[PDB]
Design an enzyme around this catalytic site. Structure first.
Site, PDB file in Angstrom:
ATOM      1  N   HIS A  52       0.815  -1.202   0.000  1.00  0.00           N
ATOM      2  CA  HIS A  52       0.000   0.000   0.000  1.00  0.00           C
ATOM      3  C   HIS A  52       0.853   1.258   0.000  1.00  0.00           C
ATOM      4  O   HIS A  52       0.478   2.260  -0.601  1.00  0.00           O
ATOM      5  CB  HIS A  52      -0.973  -0.027   1.179  1.00  0.00           C
ATOM      6  N   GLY A  64      -2.556  12.148   8.652  1.00  0.00           N
ATOM      7  CA  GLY A  64      -3.699  11.617   7.931  1.00  0.00           C
ATOM      8  C   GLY A  64      -3.791  12.075   6.486  1.00  0.00           C
ATOM      9  O   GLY A  64      -4.072  11.276   5.589  1.00  0.00           O
ATOM     10  N   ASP A  65      -3.536  13.364   6.268  1.00  0.00           N
ATOM     11  CA  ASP A  65      -3.747  14.031   4.987  1.00  0.00           C
ATOM     12  C   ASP A  65      -2.449  14.013   4.177  1.00  0.00           C
ATOM     13  O   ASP A  65      -1.437  14.546   4.629  1.00  0.00           O
ATOM     14  CB  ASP A  65      -4.234  15.475   5.257  1.00  0.00           C
ATOM     15  N   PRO A  66      -2.469  13.389   2.995  1.00  0.00           N
ATOM     16  CA  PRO A  66      -1.315  13.424   2.071  1.00  0.00           C
ATOM     17  C   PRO A  66      -0.924  14.848   1.679  1.00  0.00           C
ATOM     18  O   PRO A  66       0.247  15.107   1.365  1.00  0.00           O
ATOM     19  CB  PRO A  66      -1.815  12.651   0.844  1.00  0.00           C
ATOM     20  N   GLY A  67      -1.907  15.749   1.710  1.00  0.00           N
ATOM     21  CA  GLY A  67      -1.689  17.169   1.518  1.00  0.00           C
ATOM     22  C   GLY A  67      -0.860  17.763   2.633  1.00  0.00           C
ATOM     23  O   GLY A  67      -0.211  18.788   2.454  1.00  0.00           O
ATOM     24  N   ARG A  68      -0.876  17.106   3.787  1.00  0.00           N
ATOM     25  CA  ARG A  68      -0.132  17.546   4.961  1.00  0.00           C
ATOM     26  C   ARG A  68       1.348  17.117   4.871  1.00  0.00           C
ATOM     27  O   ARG A  68       2.228  17.852   5.297  1.00  0.00           O
ATOM     28  CB  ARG A  68      -0.828  17.035   6.237  1.00  0.00           C
ATOM     29  N   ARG A 103      -2.635   5.440  -3.498  1.00  0.00           N
ATOM     30  CA  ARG A 103      -3.922   5.684  -2.840  1.00  0.00           C
ATOM     31  C   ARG A 103      -3.803   6.907  -1.910  1.00  0.00           C
ATOM     32  O   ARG A 103      -3.296   7.934  -2.333  1.00  0.00           O
ATOM     33  CB  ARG A 103      -4.380   4.450  -2.073  1.00  0.00           C
ATOM     34  N   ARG A 149       2.639  10.172  15.466  1.00  0.00           N
ATOM     35  CA  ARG A 149       1.495  10.715  14.749  1.00  0.00           C
ATOM     36  C   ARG A 149       1.281  12.190  15.059  1.00  0.00           C
ATOM     37  O   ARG A 149       1.015  12.579  16.201  1.00  0.00           O
ATOM     38  CB  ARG A 149       0.227   9.906  15.049  1.00  0.00           C
ATOM     39  N   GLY A 151      -1.321  14.894  14.178  1.00  0.00           N
ATOM     40  CA  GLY A 151      -2.671  14.883  13.645  1.00  0.00           C
ATOM     41  C   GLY A 151      -3.602  15.938  14.191  1.00  0.00           C
ATOM     42  O   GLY A 151      -3.200  16.866  14.891  1.00  0.00           O
ATOM     43  N   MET A 179      -9.122   9.731  15.529  1.00  0.00           N
ATOM     44  CA  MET A 179      -9.551   8.527  14.835  1.00  0.00           C
ATOM     45  C   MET A 179      -8.522   7.402  14.696  1.00  0.00           C
ATOM     46  O   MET A 179      -8.875   6.313  14.261  1.00  0.00           O
ATOM     47  CB  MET A 179     -10.084   8.897  13.454  1.00  0.00           C
ATOM     48  N   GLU A 180      -7.267   7.660  15.052  1.00  0.00           N
ATOM     49  CA  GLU A 180      -6.194   6.765  14.617  1.00  0.00           C
ATOM     50  C   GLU A 180      -5.176   6.363  15.702  1.00  0.00           C
ATOM     51  O   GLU A 180      -4.499   5.336  15.566  1.00  0.00           O
ATOM     52  CB  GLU A 180      -5.480   7.378  13.394  1.00  0.00           C
ATOM     53  N   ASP A 228      -9.055  21.097  16.950  1.00  0.00           N
ATOM     54  CA  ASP A 228      -9.715  21.521  15.733  1.00  0.00           C
ATOM     55  C   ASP A 228     -11.200  21.813  15.954  1.00  0.00           C
ATOM     56  O   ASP A 228     -11.679  22.888  15.603  1.00  0.00           O
ATOM     57  CB  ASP A 228      -9.560  20.408  14.701  1.00  0.00           C
TER      58      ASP A 228
END
Length: 225
Positions: A4, A20-24, A42, A85, A87, A180-181, A203
């Protein structure tokens, strides 16, 4: 090559920053001294990050416990020694932990399935102290106020009006934060003999700080290996 992540076992650093965010990943790699784009498969983005003379991965794991578990299992099974992490989270103590506040968590409520499909429910989702204290020691060096606490890691973002949510029960139990993780990382870490930690921005500028601490800790911990 990893199913993956689509990076090799040879490309995995002892230390990994996960988000979490690939944009991050894209926003993080920019503030490092330099980076090497590794893969984007992905929701999973990989970048090697060069910071304060250290080398560490920054990988995105996506939204939710089951998809992040696939990222963590692939990291942990192929050489990661420390996973932090960085996040985003929500506050379970309003009138204390407010929007913008940063929280460094030692433990997490296991409101997933995967962790339970790995080990009995009675087992603690708990971070590594070395990692927690390091994160904490970086915030202090940077004069950035942080909270410490238990994170509720829940598979439910959008509740229904049928089954009453346990968030208020967990809040009363003095759980600070909701995401969430974290619990998944934490159980997988313990089982796989990987030290883990978690740093979250509340947030629902301080982000700059949060990322600096995260990048700070990753560099400090990377020195050992």
């Amino acid at each position: 090559l990893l199913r993956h992540l689509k990076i090799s076992k040879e490309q995995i650093t002892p230390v990994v920053l996960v988000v979490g965010d690939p944009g991050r990943v894209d926003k993080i790699k920019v503030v490092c001294d330099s980076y090497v784009d590794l893969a984007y498969n992905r929701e999973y983005k990989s970048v090697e990050c060069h910071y304060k003379g250290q080398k560490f991965l920054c990988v995105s794991h996506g939204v939710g416990s089951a998809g992040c578990a696939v990222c963590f299992e692939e990291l942990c099974q192929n050489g990661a020694k420390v996973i932090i992490r960085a996040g985003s989270c929500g506050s379970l103590q309003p009138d204390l932990i407010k929007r913008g506040d940063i929280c460094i968590c030692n433990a997490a409520v296991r409101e997933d399935r995967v962790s339970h499909l790995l080990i009995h429910g009675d087992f603690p989702a708990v971070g590594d102290f070395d990692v927690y204290d390091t994160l904490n020691k970086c915030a202090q060096e940077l004069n950035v106020p942080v909270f410490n606490g238990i994170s509720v890691s829940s598979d439910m973002y959008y509740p229904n009006k049928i089954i009453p949510s346990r968030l208020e029960d967990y809040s009363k139990a003095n759980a600070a934060v909701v995401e969430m993780e974290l619990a998944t990382l934490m159980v997988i870490g313990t089982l796989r003999k990987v030290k883990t930690g978690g740093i979250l921005i509340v947030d629902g500028h301080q982000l700059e700080n949060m990322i600096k601490i995260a990048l700070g800790a990753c560099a400090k911990l990377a020195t050992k290996y």
